[PDB]
Structure 1
Amino acid sequence: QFHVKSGLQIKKNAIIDDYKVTSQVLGLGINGKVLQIFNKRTQEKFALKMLQDCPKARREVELHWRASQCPHIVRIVDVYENLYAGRKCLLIVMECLDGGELFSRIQDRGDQAFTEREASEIMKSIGEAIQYLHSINIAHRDVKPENLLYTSKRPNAILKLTDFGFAKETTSKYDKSCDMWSLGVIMYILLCGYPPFYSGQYEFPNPEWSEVSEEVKMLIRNLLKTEPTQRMTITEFMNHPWIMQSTKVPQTPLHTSRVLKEDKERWEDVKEEMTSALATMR
């Protein structure tokens, strides 16, 4: 009749007591590395972010925490304030995800090519995650496709969203829209294999955008609005068919897999421009 969950808990004893740390790295992001780590008790493998521990982070985690309670959002498992260099530090231990950057999994699909239906399912999921956050007044502000990774390597395997180095409480023109933009961006690349290209017209090339229902070309629009406003609210976003259908979408082939094999070089480029588009955007 009544249920809550563990409040956030700043464990103080050296994480080296509760885990054995590798040096084998994974994530190579904002503040420091992401080391693989093993749970002494259970013996499972984990992601370890590490932080300077200033007032800022101390809420960034404080949110991540609230968010992990979601399926498609990465779960935090433990948060430790230890002393590294000489620096009241901050070690967050979160669920390892042996999946690979959302896209970098598709170009090793091995069997067949991609599908409008499969694109939905992906977007579909990612939608959900954003919802939650918004549904609790949280903006991620950083919904890159590096920040999307899967649990494991099976096609059953699901994907989650990471790096709240950017999230912010929508507390007491705007914000929880960046996350939308991204989804839009994400959908585009999901369907074709490229973005727009500035620093705004988005053309729709032929051997790609063709018999592809304007029903779908609709969404992408509303989302990508160079605007802050009428960028279709997620609440809104969910409502539209394609997404909320699970399985009623056309089975149309998608070149995206192959497309990405075409020009593996355009990526280190994509990534920055994606962060450019984002990060700065107010």
Structure 2
Amino acid sequence: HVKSGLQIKKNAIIDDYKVTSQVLGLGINGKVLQIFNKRTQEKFALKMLQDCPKARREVELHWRASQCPHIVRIVDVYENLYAGRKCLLIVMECLDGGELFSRIQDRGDQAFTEREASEIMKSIGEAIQYLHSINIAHRDVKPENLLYTSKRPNAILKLTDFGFAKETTGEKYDKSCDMWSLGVIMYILLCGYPPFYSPGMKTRIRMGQYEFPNPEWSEVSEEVKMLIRNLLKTEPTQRMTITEFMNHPWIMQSTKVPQTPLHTSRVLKEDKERWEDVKEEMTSALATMR
């Protein structure tokens, strides 16, 4: 199987796009902006990286991944002087749907089911599987990097930001922290809070306590808890791999998973005061996992 290599454009990007000033997010090495094609008037996202060997490898690895149905797509890459710095400008497909958990938290009826958690986990897992099978580890899988293509209920979930991705050839355990990220994301999808030991808020997980508290976890199957314990296993030598994950009946047959009603959407609203703290705890943790 043969895919073509990245042809970087040298002409001024502004010959092709109107470049606005609105932020669409904040990345590892820069800011994402809103732009429009001129000849089609269509909308797109732009990432600006200052040219250097690191940015070069981010663009390459992301390019290898681009065609995966669940990874954000690269439309073109420009090499320009942009405000007196030499930059790689990355044009990507626009993702209006928003961030994964933001969309779940905004559900007016608050009815999120185990079956939906499963389908979401299946989408993310396909992105990780694509990457791991060509020996790339993403290494920044977390809430702000999982976005929906449109606001439609049927929108596709996409993984973004390759600012930490690396080639793993030889060092295979670089892939493990991606699997841990899946464990954490799956756990949050099922109850509405992280499996972390941490105001006028409820404490969801007491320090040192059994990790599936009865209020939210009582109707979840022991099978699903075992899946999670495998993903969150402490030793990378023992943690589940992406192949084992994608072969688990809970992911493989996500179509036929119990539509068990979950507390997730409800807890995301109640605890939204501490969401930034969750994302921070995961960012810190991830820095020590990878």
TM-score by length of 1: 0.95
The verdict on how the C-alpha distance between 1:201 and 1:222 changes in structure 2, with shifts beyond 3 A counting, is farther
For 2:277 and 2:64, the matched residues in 1 are separated by 33
CA distance in 2, matches of 1:275, 1:249: 31
Q: Mark the CA change 1:123 to 1:35 in structure 2 (over 3 Å): closer, same or farther.
A: same
User: CA–CA distance in 1 between the matches of 2:136 and 2:125?
Assistant: 14
User: Is residue 191–residue 256 contact of structure 1 (8 Å, CA) maintained in 2?
Assistant: yes
Deviation at 1:198, TM superposition (A): 4.4
Q: 1:198 to 1:246 in 2, by over 3 A?
A: closer
Per the TM alignment, residue 107 of structure 1 is displaced from its structure 2 partner at its CA by: 1.4
CA distance in 2, matches of 1:258, 1:118: 15
Q: Which residue of 2 aligns with 1:267?
A: 275
30-39 vs 10-19, greater mean Cα deviation: 30-39
- How large is the Cα RMSD of the aligned pairs? 1.6
Q: How far 1:5 sits from its partner (Å)?
A: 4.1
- The alpha-carbon deviation at position 209 of structure 1 amounts to 0.9
Conserved? CA contact 1:130–1:234, under 8 Å:
yes
Give distance in 2, aligned partners of 1:167 and 1:208: 34
User: CA separation in 1, counterparts of 2:150 and 2:189?
Assistant: 20
Contact persistence 2:192–2:266 (CA under 8 A): no
**C-alpha separation between the residues in 1 aligned to 2:209 and 2:175?**
23
Could you report, residue by residue, the CA deviation over 1:9-63 in whole angstroms, capped at 9, with x for unpaired residues?
Answer: 1111110001110001111222221110101122211110000111111011111
- Contact 1:173 1:229 survives alignment (8 Å): no
SS in 2 for 1:112: coil
Q: Distance in 2 between matches of 1:191 and 1:248?
A: 17
**Deviation (angstroms), 1:158:** 1.0
Q: Deviations over 1:213-250 (max 9, x none)?
A: 10111100000011112211001111110000031111
1:281, distance to aligned residue in structure 2 (A): 2.3
**Structure-2 change in CA distance of 1:56 and 1:202 (3 Å):** farther
- Range 193-202 or range 82-91, more displaced: 193-202
> Alpha carbons of 1:83 and 1:225: their partners in 2 closer, same or farther (altered >3 Å)?
same
Structure 1 residue 179 displacement after superposition? 0.6
Stretches of structure 1 lacking an aligned partner (at least 5 in a row): none
How many residue pairs match? The answer is 280
Superposed displacement of residue 79, structure 1:
0.4
**Could you list the runs of 4 or more consecutive aligned residues of structure 1 that deviate by over 4 angstroms after TM superposition?**
198-202
Give the aligned partner of residue 204 of structure 2. none
Structure 2 gaps, min length 5: 199-207
CA distance in 2, matches of 1:173, 1:88: 34
Q: Which moved more, 1:23-32 or 1:121-130?
A: 23-32
Q: If the length of structure 2 is used for normalisation, what is the TM-score?
A: 0.92
Cα distance in structure 2, aligned partners of 1:214 and 1:16 = 55
* Cα distance, 1:173–1:94 mapped onto 2, change above 3 Å: closer
3-state DSSP of counterpart to 1:201? coil
- Assess if the C-alpha contact under 8 Å between 1:113 and 1:254 holds in 2: yes
- Cα 1:196–1:67 shift into 2, 3 Å: same
Superposition map of 1:107-118 within 5 A:
107-111=105-109, 113-118=111-116
Q: Which has the higher helix share?
A: 2
1:91-139 alpha-carbon deviations (Å, 9 max, x no partner): 1011110011110001122345010100000001100000000011110
Contact in 1 for aligned 2:112/2:261 (Cα 8 Å):
yes
C-alpha offsets along residues 70-107 of structure 1, whole Å, 9 cap, x if unaligned?
Answer: 10000000101101232221110111100111100011
Matched ranges for 1:57-76 at <5 A? 57-76=55-74
> What's the CA shift for 1:173?
8.1
Residue 279 (structure 1) shift:
2.6
Deviates more, 1:21-30 or 1:105-114: 105-114
SS of the residue aligned with 1:91?
A: strand
Paired with 2:30 and 2:286, the residues of 1 have a C-alpha distance of 21
Cα deviation for residue 6 of structure 1 reads: 3.7
Aligned to 1:179: 178
Map residues 111-260 of structure 1 onto 2, 5 A cutoff. 111=109, 113-171=111-169, 174-198=173-197, 202-260=210-268
Asked whether the 8 Å contact 1:81–1:89 carries over to 2, the reply is yes
Comparing 150-159 with 22-31, which one deviates more in the overlay? 22-31
Q: Please identify, of 106-115 and 237-246, the stretch whose mean Cα deviation from structure 2 is larger.
A: 106-115
Contact 2:110 2:266 in 1 (8 A): no
Cα distance per residue 1:236-277 (max 9 Å; x no partner): 111110000031111110110011111111111011111111
Q: Percent of aligned pairs with the same residue?
A: 100
